[PDB]
Amino acid sequence: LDANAVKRYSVVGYPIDQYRAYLYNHNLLEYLGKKVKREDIMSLIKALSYEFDLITISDLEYQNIPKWFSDNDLSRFIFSICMFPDIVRQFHALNI
Amino acid sequence: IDAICSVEGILLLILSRQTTIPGYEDELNKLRTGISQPKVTERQYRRA
Amino acid sequence: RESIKNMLGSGDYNVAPLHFLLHTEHRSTKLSKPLIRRVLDNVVQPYV
Amino acid sequence: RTIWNSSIITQRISARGLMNLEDARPPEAKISHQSELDMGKIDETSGEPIYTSGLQKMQSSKVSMANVVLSAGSDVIRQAAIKYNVVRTQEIILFE
Amino acid sequence: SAIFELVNVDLQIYQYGQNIFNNEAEHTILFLKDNTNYGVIQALQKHPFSATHINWHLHKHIFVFHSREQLLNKLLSAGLEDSQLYQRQKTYSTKRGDRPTERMVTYIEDDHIRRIQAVFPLLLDNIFDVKL
Amino acid sequence: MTLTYWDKEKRMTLKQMIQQVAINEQENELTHYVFTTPLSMPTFGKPMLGYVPLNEVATSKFFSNVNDFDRDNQLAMAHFPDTTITQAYNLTNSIKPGDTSLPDAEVAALKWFWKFFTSINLVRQPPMDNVMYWACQFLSSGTSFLPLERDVEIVFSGFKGSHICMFSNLRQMNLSPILCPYYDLITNFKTTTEIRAYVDAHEELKSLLTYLCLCTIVGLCDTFTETRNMDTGEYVWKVRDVVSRNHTPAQNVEKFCYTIQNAKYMIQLVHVLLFPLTDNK
Amino acid sequence: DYFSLEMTPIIMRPKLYDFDMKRGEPVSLLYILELILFSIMFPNVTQHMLGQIQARILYISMYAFRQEYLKFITKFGFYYKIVNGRKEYIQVTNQNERMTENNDVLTGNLYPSLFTDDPTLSAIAPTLAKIARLMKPTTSLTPDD
Amino acid sequence: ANLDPAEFENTPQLIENSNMTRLQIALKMLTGDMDDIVKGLILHKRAC
Amino acid sequence: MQNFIPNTDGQFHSFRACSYAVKDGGNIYRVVQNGDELNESLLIDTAI
Numbered sequence: 040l041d042a043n044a045v046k047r048y049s050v051v052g053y054p055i056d057q058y059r060a061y062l063y064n065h066n067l068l069e070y071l072g073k074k075v076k077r078e079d080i081m082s083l084i085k086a087l088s089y090e091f092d093l094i095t096i097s098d099l100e101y102q103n104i105p106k107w108f109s110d111n112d113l114s115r116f117i118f119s120i121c122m123f124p125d126i127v128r129q130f131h132a133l134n135i
Numbered sequence: 136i137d138a139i140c141s142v143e144g145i146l147l148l149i150l151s152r153q154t155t156i157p158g159y160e161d162e163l164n165k166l167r168t169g170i171s172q173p174k175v176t177e178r179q180y181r182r183a
Numbered sequence: 184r185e186s187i188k189n190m191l192g193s194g195d196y197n198v199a200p201l202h203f204l205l206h207t208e209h210r211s212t213k214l215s216k217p218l219i220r221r222v223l224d225n226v227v228q229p230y231v
Numbered sequence: 232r233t234i235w236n237s238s239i240i241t242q243r244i245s246a247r248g249l250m251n252l253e254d255a256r257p258p259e260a261k262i263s264h265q266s267e268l269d270m271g272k273i274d275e276t277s278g279e280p281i282y283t284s285g286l287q288k289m290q291s292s293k294v295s296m297a298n299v300v301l302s303a304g305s306d307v308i309r310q311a312a313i314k315y316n317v318v319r320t321q322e323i324i325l326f327e
Numbered sequence: 328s329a330i331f332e333l334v335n336v337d338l339q340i341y342q343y344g345q346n347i348f349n350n351e352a353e354h355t356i357l358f359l360k361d362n363t364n365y366g367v368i369q370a371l372q373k374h375p376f377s378a379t380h381i382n383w384h385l386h387k388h389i390f391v392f393h394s395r396e397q398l399l400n401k402l403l404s405a406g407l408e409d410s411q412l413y414q415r416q417k418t419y420s421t422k423r424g425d426r427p428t429e430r431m432v433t434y435i436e437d438d439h440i441r442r443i444q445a446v447f448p449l450l451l452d453n454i455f456d457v458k459l
Numbered sequence: 460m461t462l463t464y465w466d467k468e469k470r471m472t473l474k475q476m477i478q479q480v481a482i483n484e485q486e487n488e489l490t491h492y493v494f495t496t497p498l499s500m501p502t503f504g505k506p507m508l509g510y511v512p513l514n515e516v517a518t519s520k521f522f523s524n525v526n527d528f529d530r531d532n533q534l535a536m537a538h539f540p541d542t543t544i545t546q547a548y549n550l551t552n553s554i555k556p557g558d559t560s561l562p563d564a565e566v567a568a569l570k571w572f573w574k575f576f577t578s579i580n581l582v583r584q585p586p587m588d589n590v591m592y593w594a595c596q597f598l599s600s601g602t603s604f605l606p607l608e609r610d611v612e613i614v615f616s617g618f619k620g621s622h623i624c625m626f627s628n629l630r631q632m633n634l635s636p637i638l639c640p641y642y643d644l645i646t647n648f649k650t651t652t653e654i655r656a657y658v659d660a661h662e663e664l665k666s667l668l669t670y671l672c673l674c675t676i677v678g679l680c681d682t683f684t685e686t687r688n689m690d691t692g693e694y695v696w697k698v699r700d701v702v703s704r705n706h707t708p709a710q711n712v713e714k715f716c717y718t719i720q721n722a723k724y725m726i727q728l729v730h731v732l733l734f735p736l737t738d739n740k
Numbered sequence: 741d742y743f744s745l746e747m748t749p750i751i752m753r754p755k756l757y758d759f760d761m762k763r764g765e766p767v768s769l770l771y772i773l774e775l776i777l778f779s780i781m782f783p784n785v786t787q788h789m790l791g792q793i794q795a796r797i798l799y800i801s802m803y804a805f806r807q808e809y810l811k812f813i814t815k816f817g818f819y820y821k822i823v824n825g826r827k828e829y830i831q832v833t834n835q836n837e838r839m840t841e842n843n844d845v846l847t848g849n850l851y852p853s854l855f856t857d858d859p860t861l862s863a864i865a866p867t868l869a870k871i872a873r874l875m876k877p878t879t880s881l882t883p884d885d
Numbered sequence: 886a887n888l889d890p891a892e893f894e895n896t897p898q899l900i901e902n903s904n905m906t907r908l909q910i911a912l913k914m915l916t917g918d919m920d921d922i923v924k925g926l927i928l929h930k931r932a933c
Numbered sequence: 934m935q936n937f938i939p940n941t942d943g944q945f946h947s948f949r950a951c952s953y954a955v956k957d958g959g960n961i962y963r964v965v966q967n968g969d970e971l972n973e974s975l976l977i978d979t980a981i
Contacts, residue, residue, distance in 0.1 A: 042508040043201060044210045044960040048303045052270050054296045057280060057288050058914040064278025065906060067301045072528035078837055084315060091321040091763060093839075098203045098969060102311045110710075110719060113890065114897040115140045123139065137901070144899025145908075154896070157714050158623045158909070160687075162916035199962065202752070202972040204314060215958050222954045224848050225508060226541050226552045227961060232933070237925040242918040274630060275516045276525045277906075285631065286465050290624065292917045320763035332810055333802075335835035365583050375888045395888070436886040504843040504850060505968075510959070526903075555959030706886075711895045716902065742981055749938035751964065752971050757978045778979050784940040785977065787948060822947070844967045846950055856946045877943050 045101075047071065073099075074106045146183055150175060267295040331360055337370070339391075354401075355391045362386040371434060378402070378431040398433065398440060405429050406447050413451045461667055462632040466619050476666050478617070479673070481599060483609040488703060491606040492589045494737045497730045499575050500582040506535040513548040513569065514633045521576070522728060523630035524678075524721050537574035544569060548635050568642035569635060575731045579723050587679070590726050591702045593733055594672045602655050602665075604737055613677070613698045620687060620694020622677065626715065629674060638664055638732070645735040654735060668732055675725045676701060678717055681709045746784050753788050755841070761800060768800045776874055783877035791845035794852045797871065799839050808865035815864060820851035827858070938964075 040046060048067065053060075077099050085094050109115065120126055147154070152172050155163060188196070198212045220227050245267070248260040271283040280288045280298040288295060330338070337360055341352035357374070359366050367385065371377050376392035378401070379385050392398050409429035415421060430447065433440065464470035511517075511533060519525060536542055542552050543560040548569075554560055595611050596604060615622075641664055644654050658665055677683065682704050685696035708722040709715070761768045775793060779786040786793070802809045817831025832838055845852050854872050862869035892898075900908065938951055954963040 040211070040509070040960075043208075045201075045208050046211055046304065048301050050273075050299060050301055052297075052299045055298065055300060056914075057295055057298050058910050060280060060298045060300045061278045061289070061910055062907065064273060064280075064301050065910075067303060068276065068278065069526065069903065070303075070307070072526065073531070074528055076529060076531075080313070088317070089319065091319060093318045093320065093759075095316040095318075097314055097316075098205065099313065100203070100969065101206070101208065101306075101309065102313065103309075104311045104313075109898075109901070111892060111898045114892055115136065115899070118143075118897055118899075119136045119140055126136070140899050141901065141904065147899065155713065156905075156909075157712065157716065158621070159912065162912050165916050166912075201966070201970060203970060204972070204976075205312060206309065211960070213957065213960070218956050219953060220956055222952050222961070222963065224539060224541070225506070225967075226539065227954070227956050233928055233930050235927045235929060236923070237927050238923060240923055274519055275512075276520050276523070276630075281631070285463060286467070287627065287631075289913060290465075290467055290621075292913075294918055318759055318761070320761065322762075329806075329810055332813070332835065333806070365585075368586060372887070375890075434887045504848070508961075553956060553959060553961060707891065710892045710898065712898050716898065716905075718902070742977070745975075745977070747936045747940070749936065750940060752966055752975055754975045754977055755971060757976050758980065774979055778981075783943075787941045787945070788950070789977075790945065842969055846948065847952065847965065847967045851947065876945055877941070879943070881943055 070103055075104050075108075080104070150180070150183075264293075266291065266293050268297045269295060270297045270299060273299055335360065354393060354397070357389050357391050358387055359389060376435070378433050380426065380431065381428050382426040395435075395437070398435065399443070402431055402433075402440065402443065405431055406443075407455045407457045410451055410453065410455055411457060414454060461637065461663065462628060464625075465628045465631075466621060466624060468619070472666055472670060476669055478615065480614045480616070481611055482614065483599075483611050484700065486610055486703070487608050488610055489608070490592070492592045494593065494734070495585055495730075496740050497575060497727070497734050498582050498584060499577075501535075501538060501574055501577040502581070503532045503535055503578060505532060507533040508536065508552060510545075510549045510551050511536060513544065513550045513573065514635045515631070517548075518632065518634055519630040521724060522721070523626060524715075524717060525630070527718050527721060530720070530724075532578060534573050534577050537570045537577060540570070542570070564643050564646065565639055567646050568639055571646060572638075572642050572731070576724075576727065579720060579727060582723075582727065584723060584727055584730065586706075587708075587726055588702065588706055590729055591676060591679075591705055594676050594729055595702055597733060597736070598669055598672055602658055602736060607702075610700055610703055612700060613673070614695065615697070616695045617693045619692045620685065620696060622685070622694075622696065623715065625674060626678065629671075634667065637667060641735070651736070651738065658736070671732070672729050675729050678715050679708055679722060679725065680705050681711060683711075683714050685714070742782075746782055750785075750788060753791075753846070754785065756789060756792055759796065763803055766804060768804065772797060772800060772871070776871075779875045783879070786875070788846060790852055790855070791843065792841040794845070794854060795839045795841055797854075801868065805865075805867060808868060812865040812868060816853050816858070816861060818853055820853065820856065821849055822851070827856070829853070 048071070077096060080096055080099070081094055084096075085092060088094075148156075149167055150170060150172070152167065184198075198209065200207045200209045220230060222228065244261065245263045246261060248257055250257055250260070266282075269282045269288070271281045271288070273280050278301075282288055282291075288298060338358045339355060340358075341355045343350055344353050357370070359370055363386070367379065367389065370389055371379070374389070374391050376394070376398055378390045378392070378398070379388070392401070406429070412426075412429050416427075430444075433444070435441070461472050464472050464475045520530065536550055536552065539552075542550060543554060544550050544566050545554055545558050545560060550569075550573075560566070592607070596607055599607065599611055621627075640661075641654075641657070644657055677698055680698050680701055682700055683696070683698045685694055687694045708719060709717050759771075761771055775797075779793075798809075813831070815829075817829050819830045820827050821830060843850065854868065855876075861872075886894075942948055950965055952963075952965070954961055956962075
């Protein structure tokens, strides 16, 4: 449970191989829990817009937003663009 | 782009003997005992 | 509770969900030994 | 018979024989190892079922059909939908 | 203080050298949003070419250069100046000013620049006919 | 009793602490740093009420580099001096089933500690070279806290080498009803002398925090190598010149691929648990 | 509906819908006046929206008063906390996010600034004492025997 | 250091840390006891 | 009869809106429900 007392999930024993169970628990506990801040979404939708704006967001609870960050972001980029230049074509297409 | 990067990574895992992961390091010497490095080259890499 | 409520009177009623701007959630309803207390600084005080 | 296994070839034999040749235990029947019927708690953070002794069920290299699993219930496809309110501050062109 | 409390961005300004008819900024000084030391280390970590004095003005300004080998000459000039200053300090003939030392600090883990800056504070005796 | 350090084979943390070697080298780094009040920086007006655990999933979620799910203010129920703790060490504000709370001093100490842990990326923690210095200081000179005057290398020999499993049986380890009396001593204003006497005497927590500082440095260093003696199942792994060649966390994905904010967690940890040994503010 | 919303027991803290404001020009003062009227007409609903109104009016002031604004922040930064009868002021020493509106400002030991007198408030940043004094209801208190 | 920003000193993290766990799981599973290949045996005729 | 929770003492000094609440064995339901929560029936406009 939690505050406000909303049933999140239920643990239960069962006969099943250890790996499958590990996986079922793992991807669930991943689907729970705040994966991103609020001011962060604020910052994103601010950066993608006109430069004189105020933004307001609401109810970032119980909603699961997949994260698009990685400390490696620059690394994965420079790795991708280096060995697959064709990507820049669709880059330019997005921009146009 | 994350998808293509993960593809390249996972493929890099089962080849190129000169890389491990922080841990097991032995079931890799169970897995990659089928490739028989260094008979592997491009024609094969692209098929993979 | 539904079986009884359909045997005392008529109509319908809910069990205290909590709203939001878009979605609602149905908090749990158990109510064993309810008590009324005042809550200073989000810490339930004892009765005084 | 001619062939003979030189090493052990029975790791996947949970039980051999449910008979009762003399209405008792057959003197060479094999019930399962107690290792494969353990149901220990899970660290509530990353699944990872552990044995009751404290050893994790991920290092013994022995399968076991007695672990636990989570279950969400009624809200797993609650999909990420939020609303945002924008407001300009400086018009593009003044006096207009 | 008022400015920084009102804007909350680091402030960057340039220095365009002598010989007025030049406009290229040979380098750029940069003021920090939090005059404490921790912020100095922080901002110095990024900005891949940086240096700062030891004078209290440290708290208010960091440097940012253009290249890898633009650091070297500035560091060497500052080192010659620190030689002159150490000398004129030896005989307690310190001018109407401050800045105990002139040398710099940096985080460039370059073998060459670190070799220079390490061997330097052991040769603070001689006079190096600065620019004359 | 602390935890059977697992390797597929049991342990007692004492064999596993006398298992290593801390051997010194040249190049005296005459660079004696100084301690610092550990910058509690607690604040936010949006807590998470309810039953928040405080022992095992607590320590795992915080220091086992498990999911970096923003791991935020949820500990903010460490201000508000009127909260309570239930013997399983669940911090709450409403003890439900007639369950009992702890005595006062215990509560004071525990809240003090986690309060220090509340809100990292607003904490202004000190650079890491210094915290490496203090860590090696402690585990080398002992509780006397003499400056190093040298440099140190660490080496482990014979484990069925699983330093990942070291971090794991950390993930499965409780600490609160181990370090409670210690911070209790620091709450009611005792002094360095008597608390050093204490840590020397009890020696259950001494081994623990030895192991803990050790694990944090091996997880945040980058002069690390490992090897398996291929005649038996036995890894020898070494970390060389711990304090001179380290200035940032690690990313070599061969040893322990460590993220960032949990790293600043870890340095806050070693900071705030070595704090009460040393001298004045 | 708005008029009836004056008396029924509020159970969920309300937020304001629309907010238009030009950043530099002196027209936003119109919006200030709009909410002053909306406060002098329904003193009840304001009692809860106080949290949002704090940050909004303060923002607008910051772009139309500078000496008063930053001086005020320096002294009476952002929040009352009644320690034991005294009132300690906590600030926000960072322009990271000043214009937040979600800080449970009306329950818990955390009061908004701008409002309780501390007569030194005036004669420190006028037009802000002038704003605040204009909004307090000051009508009556009647029993309902 | 400090020119190469922070994370170019080594092989770059390709697979995401979450997916790494799923990798490890499948590895440990398929290389454990569920393996099948077995080495060596002995020919000998006996009427046992 | 509907209205029984007063909405103000007047002065915008320490009002401290009502704080009675029902505790139900661990779970706690509040009357005023602090925290980020509302419904379009209560999002109000000013231009009115």
